[PDB]
Design an enzyme around this catalytic site. Structure first.
Site, short mmCIF file in Angstrom:
data_model
loop_
_atom_site.label_atom_id
_atom_site.label_comp_id
_atom_site.label_asym_id
_atom_site.label_seq_id
_atom_site.Cartn_x
_atom_site.Cartn_y
_atom_site.Cartn_z
N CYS A 37 0.67 -1.15 0.06
CA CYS A 37 -0.05 0.06 0.21
C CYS A 37 0.86 1.39 0.10
O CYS A 37 0.81 1.93 1.05
CB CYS A 37 -0.83 0.04 1.28
SG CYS A 37 -2.22 -1.24 1.08
N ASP A 39 3.53 2.63 -3.37
CA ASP A 39 3.54 3.08 -5.02
C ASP A 39 4.18 4.54 -4.80
O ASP A 39 3.34 5.49 -4.53
CB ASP A 39 2.18 2.90 -5.28
CG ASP A 39 1.51 1.76 -5.16
OD1 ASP A 39 2.21 0.69 -4.95
OD2 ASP A 39 0.22 1.86 -4.86
N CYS A 63 15.36 10.39 0.02
CA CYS A 63 15.65 10.02 1.30
C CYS A 63 16.94 11.14 1.77
O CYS A 63 16.51 12.30 2.41
CB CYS A 63 16.17 8.83 1.84
SG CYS A 63 15.44 8.15 3.62
N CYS A 106 12.28 -4.76 -5.23
CA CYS A 106 12.70 -3.47 -5.79
C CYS A 106 13.24 -3.64 -7.08
O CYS A 106 13.75 -2.98 -8.03
CB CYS A 106 13.86 -2.92 -4.91
SG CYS A 106 13.33 -1.15 -4.49
#
Length: 128
Positions: A37, A39, A63, A106
């Site tokens: 949940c 994206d 980040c 990933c």
């Protein structure tokens, strides 16, 4: 003496937008989200008149202190053709980037961003 001084470029528009100089008409649109949940990944390519990938771009959450992160795909597709970029395998980017099994997802979300950008391009130029 023989060489001249061209026009130097600096401090011109922002960066890390996820697109190679605005949105051309031969640019591919792709949007793949992580297996949950969330994206927040993006990958757009630029096809030439020869139907080949000339440019590449992507986007992610981010980040800090990353310096060119997840920008290994933008170089892979670059210079390649949609037909070739479609043969890409997650295991490749996952084995080349070197990462644990926990962050293996990933490596899959990447491929998805590839096909999308492709099927998206020919989809906008499928008008015949």
């Amino acid at each position: 003496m023989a060489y001249s001084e061209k026009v130097i470029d600096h401090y011109e528009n922002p960066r890390n937008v996820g697109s190679f100089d605005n949105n051309d008409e031969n640019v591919g649109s792709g949007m793949v989200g992580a297996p949950a949940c969330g994206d927040v990944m993006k990958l757009q390519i630029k096809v030439n008149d020869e139907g080949i990938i000339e440019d590449a771009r992507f986007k992610t959450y981010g980040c800090g202190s990353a310096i060119a992160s997840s920008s290994l795909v933008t170089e892979w597709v670059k210079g390649k053709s949609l037909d070739e970029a479609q043969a890409i395998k997650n295991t490749d980017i996952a084995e080349e980037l070197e990462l644990p099994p926990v962050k293996i997802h990933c490596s899959i979300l990447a491929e998805d961003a590839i096909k999308a950008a492709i099927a998206d391009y020919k989809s906008k130029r499928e008008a015949k």
